[PDB]
């Protein structure tokens, strides 16, 4: 604990003395100006920058962990971290620090992404060095330098894969509680990399899946609409071609359904979230899974000699058509607006329907208290009749049942004022404010949904080809601690 | 009056002369540098800052009273008052200046709170001293001071209670006209202290009360819905279990009602405001009280052999369900929205309904002037028929009564244009502007409502336990004008 | 024209040379630094500052006329005008320049107000001088000057009257096209003077008129509602007391009506605007006049043995109730909101109803040509049926008339989409934006309406008493070009 | 390629040497401080500023082309371009640089306008020079200089025409994809020139065309409404005057229609856009053309012994009335608002109706799956019944068909909540946001529509008169490189 007491004292000069009898903690938790530059040139023994702390984490992992996304902190942090790392690298050219993973098995780039970081993530991905024997750690390179025309290349190592994972997967597949999961896709390379991956392959296949899905939905809808009318399914088939077409439609329907069942469940088992993200996010897959569940229940009942298979079936069909909106991602205007609707439903409907339902139940049960007979005596019907005022078909004399029509009318009028004049207009105004406040979150989430689409298409891809690399076997430096050549698949930007 | 002339003239040197033959007023009303620094060093006798003025108020009470809570005033005021405090402490270590109450029986902290103060209130609550043997008047302390990690403690004396009252009660139970009753709860200690008290005990008890209330309301609703149908209450009971269940429901209903009656009335007799806070504030308790009044009237009629107990009863039931919204305080998303609605009704309904009612009455009486017969001849029915247009069931040919259908149609069309197309859209737009105007005040008022909940739960609490103290008997200073130790219940923040 | 060439050339040295052989134009149109100081202090003959130009206007009138309400212009203008005028006052202390009116018969203050000016009007009304022999032109005085406590006076000459008119009348009774007809009431004395005049007398009598008007309207409404039912007015009276009540109501009704007729017409003949203010402004008096016109037509027909007096009468009654909203001035919330409605109708209804009427007429005539028979064949009925879609009672199958029901349905659906889904929502959104745009102007117009109310009450006042002076015979200066005292009924402010 | 390498190296001194053995590229693509001033004074031979590059672009064309509308770049660009051009002009006063056109046959002013440029376009139009023998290139002058009054003339060459085209045509008739086609009319002269041409000539004839069109539309509407009722058109005429009136109406109708046909098609052949403007712009003419097409189809069927000419005719009539809104340009309030509506439809209706139609189709298919009988069995009628909920005539019991009314009601209620409560309010809110987002763009597009109106009227004009010139044969300089006088039709600006 000699360094613990030493940095507790934190005197600028005595550090050159106490070392005569954890450096990672000194550089990380404190980041003093003099200590970090001197720990590698101690009079007893210098500090091993590549070494691990008491749990196994290296210097870079703590250096990342400390940084906390504040401007004045960040301005200091970038320069201090860059200087200590370039000194440590020039001194020990044989080894690289960022490739060794922490206790959890994550690189410093992966940790920075998972915790959710901007200045650090940007710094790690966009490192630029313009000195010989110091390009060993750089990522940004320049080839052309005109007055008006500037171009550059990025290696993008570990953004496709470091053979375990990639930073893009980490940003996209965060826990959904990360403060800045969306903003991390605003870095210089990732936006254009996603854009090129969209331009190349993902755009066409995504629209293809959309067209296939539309045909699937049409086929299912046709199969439903011409369903038979007799009781006790399944039904004896005749050799008339109509039965063959209908059976074709049913078979395609259930096949597509269980295919979606497998796609959803295999998504789930590929992450196993602890019931957090399933409600914070992941709605788009949950809904398709629910569709598949309903389809299967329907066919189970269909073979089970039950009439009510129709009841299950239609729900899926309804849900099926609604889930068409899932594909509105991929379009500049449509997808953003659809996500805006989905977020407005999720944010608003619970809180609104609570108030509205309190009022409806209160006034409905009040009025059904008032009226009596030996109809509208039922609570359900009166709940409907007071509902109808919200769709603009309220009656104001929906019964003639006596016993104090005066208070009856007073109650209806108060209900109307509360619900139809005051509450709904208030809802409209709140939705207006919500919209004006969520324009930007809608843009972000649309970009994220595109990122998810691209990642799924590349990850599954079901063809085993190499249709992922950016720009071929481009040689960039050729000046490593060894004199060997390099091929690292850089990407050109202008 | 030699001091009066001295400070009315404000000559820098002659002040040493007139004193050779009120210092509180001198330091308070003007706050000059030489006056404040010089009244303690007079050639005849120095000023006794602990003494009382002509009415009984001490120096600090006037020093608070003069303060006006503006920025450029605030900085100089803080400096001068801190100098006053440190000089008084060092010179008169035997006693403390702020503990003596004024004529009204209020401390300087209480007076600053009741008037409504931010800079002054914050200063009084967060005094800091950086000298040994002068911590006697400190309230802010430090324990851990790293580069990135800082933590501190606050004594919080008189925020829970000084055995008569506390500053938190003063802020929360202000006169409801104080300009900044809400903003005063955003200071460093009170916000976190309320948050902690919410976390510890109040949250569970409040939710429990909510669940109990919901069960009460359900019980009452059930009792109402299955009320008997015969005339002339009360009704003979039979040994059938249904009658005992109904009687159980009625008994629980009236018991809960009169319990709320006592809760409301006991609140009132604990304040008895002179109609100021009664109407700008205290809406929830008035509403619950009104519910209980209606319940009791229903009981009275029920025993009084009157059928009209139904009419009274339902009103309470209606009000009962509405008052369920009271509990939406305590939920970050819901309660703010509920308060926003309540404020919108209060601000808007009078002004809107005035215009709408003028139009409705004018056109109803105009049209019923026009039409005649030997129905819709009545004013009431025509008031309804012109009402119906605003719920989207207007008819435009609701009668065939002759005598100038041309002007009749002209009148209806003008009414529709004024009311249905112009006025309602105008209402919607105004709510749209009002919402964006009141978002922040709504946040403040919800925080205030939670504060009221916390205070009510803690003060009554019906257990006689000590479930109020923050962090146990923590010793903070131990260096008093005497050498005795201290225990003051500090609270840690960081 | 020697001086115009002199000041076009504007060389500093030739100024004293050329004057060896109009100065108002020189000082006014150009306002050079050196020239104006010499023109009154020439070695040959100085210029007469009190003189008139070729049309009769004095120096101050041109000095006002030049100023054009720009910040950098204004900063220069205030200093140059104040210095040249104080120099002229010192040189010619016997006479005052501002009292002589221009060719139009207006004082410099009146001209500044009529053109609509802020810095200039504020300067003219709020002159402050703190030197002996220079208070002769001051209008602002100070009595108490502490840090926080200030107390002062305004003389306010010509704000009550200069025996022809006052500045407040000029501001309020402008031509309604003046750019600053509203903002001119934001000066220091006028706002408080209006407030005090409101507090003193105008508030009570205005509310009294309001109560009287309400009683008048109720009386009229009652008289209308129980109108007789037989044909051929007037009707023989019986000694039944009901006839006497009705005749009382009619007599009071027509008396109040013709009284309003005289009030409106006497307002008009008291200004005779050239159709400019009559349409951009003066809406209230036009409406009251129209009410009275309808009343008169009704009584004419009533004696003329015509039934149609009913048709006229009701219109007035309808208009009468609408004009109730006129009195919403005087209230902090209500009047502003009423003005917002009136402005919304005025600016919006023409533009909206144009689009809506184009669509309605186009689709209605399209459908009515489509359908045919040997009803809905009429254009009017179909105009109604397509109207009903806007109030939410459209039918979509209002006719079974054949001949291409397919295009018929296409047309109705297109109409619905254009009008009911798109146009009305667009109207709502535009009303929202307009409301956000007119948030501040409405307060100005309400303050102006109060100013109009106060001015009318003081103008008529029907008592002949002297209940108008501000604050008694307060002595202010005592140092004039003569050594006499001063009593001018200045006003106290703090 | 000697200069390519020379300007790749960009050495400040070696330029005096390398020239001993393209300058249009050197000045433009790089714009170095030293090179451009020295290229005209080389020791071997100076650069010919008037020369053309390998394709035919002059120095000005490249100088324009490089500029890319950035503020700091533009500040540099103005001074560098002005200095090089004035030096080159003073050296070669015989020739002018702007007159020779590029490879495309455009002047540098026209090219700057077509690409869409502000600083450069403004510079080219508003050049000012304050030196003798250097005003030869100026466009802005000063002729009057008083204290308050500054006024001048503008030459405005090529703004009316350079005998091929003009800058105003280029700005107005851009490709519709230019980033700033509308902002470019904010330059100093063009706004006032459009205002003047409006004031003088275009206003009257435009309103005249509007009145003529209105009469045309009325005539056609009357002709339609009294159309015959017998089958098998055309119909035998009788000499009754009514038939001649109707035939007059028909003849006027078809004549106006085919005139519009020729108008639209001749406009098209005068541009031949490459399928871009026909979708991003040009709606206001496409719609009139579509009207003409429908009219022609109607007359074809009318002679073709078909009844369906009614079906064609009405559509034109419907479209005809809608196209009335075309003339709302020319009005300060109306035109802006109409264009706002047109943009709202174009931007919003596709995206909204997609979501709405997905929901409607899904739920209609679901319900019609559920219900059956031995009507509402049809998909179409159920599509209508679920439609009606959006116009406020939803029924909630539109059938009594059994088989699981519970899920049926659940489906309808979910539909109502999704469509009538959520989506429709979101439409309203989005229109609310969109309006505030397009407050300012609409003014620009309205000014552009006026510009189109003025240009069309002036270019066609069918009179052969000279009703275009600004201010007569005004002489500007009279001091050319030759000693000849000048007459260039300047315009007076105050």
From Swiss-Prot, chains A, B, C, D:
Which positions bear Phosphoserine?
274
Q: Biological process GO terms, please? A: behavioral response to pain; calcium ion import across plasma membrane; calcium ion transmembrane transport; calcium ion transport; cellular response to acidic pH; cellular response to alkaloid; cellular response to ATP; cellular response to cytokine stimulus
Q: Provide the residue intervals of the ANK repeats.
A: 1-21, 22-48, 57-93, 107-130, 165-187
Catalytic reaction annotation: Ca(2+)(in) = Ca(2+)(out); Mg(2+)(in) = Mg(2+)(out); Na(+)(in) = Na(+)(out); K(+)(in) = K(+)(out)
An example of a GO molecular function for this protein is: metal ion binding
Modified after translation how?
Answer: Phosphorylation by CAMKII seems to regulate binding to vanilloids. Phosphorylated and modulated by PRKCE, PRKCM and probably PRKCZ. Dephosphorylation by calcineurin seems to lead to receptor desensitization and phosphorylation by CAMKII recovers activity.
Where does it reside? Answer: Postsynaptic cell membrane; Cell projection, Dendritic spine membrane; Cell membrane
Q: Which residues bind Ca(2+)?
A: 395
Assembly and interaction partners: Homotetramer. Interacts with PIRT. May also form a heteromeric channel with TRPV3. Interacts with CALM, PRKCM and CSK. Interacts with PRKCG and NTRK1, probably by forming a trimeric complex. Interacts with the Scolopendra mutilans RhTx toxin. Interacts with the spider Tau-theraphotoxin-Hs1a. Interacts with TMEM100. Interacts with PACS2.
What the protein does comes down to: Non-selective calcium permeant cation channel involved in detection of noxious chemical and thermal stimuli. Seems to mediate proton influx and may be involved in intracellular acidosis in nociceptive neurons. Involved in mediation of inflammatory pain and hyperalgesia. Sensitized by a phosphatidylinositol second messenger system activated by receptor tyrosine kinases, which involves PKC isozymes and PCL. Activation by vanilloids, like capsaicin, and temperatures higher than 42 degrees Celsius.
Q: Which family does it belong to?
A: Belongs to the transient receptor (TC 1.A.4) family. TrpV subfamily. TRPV1 sub-subfamily.
Which protein, by its recorded name, is this?
A: Transient receptor potential cation channel subfamily V member 1
The top of its lineage is:
Eukaryota, Metazoa, Chordata, Craniata, Vertebrata
**Encoding gene, per UniProt annotation:** Trpv1
